[PDB]
Structure formats: structure tokens, C-alpha cells
Amino acid sequence: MGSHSMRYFYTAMSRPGRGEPRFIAVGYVDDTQFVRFDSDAASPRMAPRAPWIEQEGPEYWDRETQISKTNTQTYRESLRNLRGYYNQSEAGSHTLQRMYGCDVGPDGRLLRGHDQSAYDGKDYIALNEDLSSWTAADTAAQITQRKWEAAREAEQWRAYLEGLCVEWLRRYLENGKETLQRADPPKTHVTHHPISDHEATLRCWALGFYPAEITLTWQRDGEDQTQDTELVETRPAGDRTFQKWAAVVVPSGEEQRYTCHVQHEGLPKPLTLRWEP
């Protein structure tokens, strides 16, 4: 695609009897994490997680930290408010999640911005795509919506998503150009797993690719075996790259009617793979 995104992921969770609610924030460019903050660190601060961010100066790290400390206290206040909205006891633990950010095209221009929130894993409130209105999922979120309309929050989101977000995303893409703007193609192969005397498993592997977006499909006689293909969730290798496999059960002997097809940004052209015994 050559288009890119920046996302921040905020989590705040209550733990009554075990101190004040914990606050964690992580920042991503595409599938690369680049910052973290944990209010449970001995010295809480926004800390680098990718080498291209370490070069930012202190005023950068000072601002990122002071904002996250404020948010630690604000999200504790939100968790008290949300407990109220749902008439919930002070003994249970609850979770607030937020993710926000921007998508830019291969020219650095904003495609669209995002800000969504979840309470206890349930969609709660989302900034609409117009960046000026909200969608509340229930009468509790409606309360949050009235506060935000009065606080004039959507206008602040628009100014952040159109301005700072894409400018700093653009800057990161340049500072981390050798990695963020490098698609590494998958290394692939097909393995063969005898099951019985009359059927076997063909497993198609994709290793070492980046970013994680990828297509793996089996075809039998040129027709997709989507209902019969077992997919694992794309998984991280630990080294920035990802892994994935697709598997199909085939009658023994018919193995050549089956093809595995691989799409990824790193490959010059899509791949067709067969078992070669």
C-alpha cells in the first residue's frame, strides 16, 4: 500500500484492595511498537521501544511523560465515573481501553483519523469519521458524550488528528525509513503431514514477513478452500517479523490439485506453491 498509520493504545484497570488503577500506554507505527508508559514502573516515564525514536530530545520525552502522568490521574477519575454510570460495586475490577490515531496515504496526506473507547471490552464511545460528532453505545456513554460536547473535545481531536498526528507520523516514517518503509517478504514452504492411509495435511508456511498483513489461501483445482482451510492467527517472531500458516486436509494422491497462494507487500508478484516431495 505504501500507506501508514500511527496508533496509541491506552489501558486503565481497577484493582480494588491492590492500590490505585494501573495505566499503560503504548504507541505504534504500522506494526512496530515505538514507545511505552506504565504507571506501575518505579520511575514512570514514556520510554523508547524502537531505535529511530531514541534520537528525540528531552522536551519530547518530558512532554510525553507529563501527559501520561496526567492521564494516569484522569483515567482513574474516568474509572470512578464509569463505575457510577453502571451502578457497579466498588469491589470488582474494570477496564477502560482507548485507541486513537491517524492513517496517511503514500503522500503523507491524512486518509482518516480514529478515537474509540471500550469499557470492560465492550464498545463504549467512538469519534465518528467526520471528526466532529460522537457515537455513544448506551445511555452511560451518552453522559460521556454530553461532557465531551460541552468540553469541545471533537474539535480538539480534529486539530490533533489533522495536525500533530500526521506531522509526527511523517517525521517518524522518515527517521525510521530503513525499517518502517521496508517490506520484508515471507519465506515460504509447504510441508506434508500424513494422517491416515487415505488423507494427509498440507501446511503452507509464511515466515519472517513484515508488515503483518498477508493473504494465505489454498485452492483445490483453482477454487478457494476457505471453509476447509485451518488458519493460525498471525504471530510475532520476536524480531519485528511475523509468522502464519494455512493447512488443508487432502485425499492422499490428490496432493497436486492443491495450490497455496501468498500475497504480501514484500513480494514482487504473488506466489503459487505446491508440495514438492
Partner: peptide, 9 residues
Amino acid sequence: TVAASGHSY
């Protein structure tokens, strides 16, 4: 860079 801290929920 993060957004300015805003209004509580």
C-alpha cells in the same frame, strides 16, 4: 506524539 490530555469520561 500523544494527544494532549483531555476531559475524563
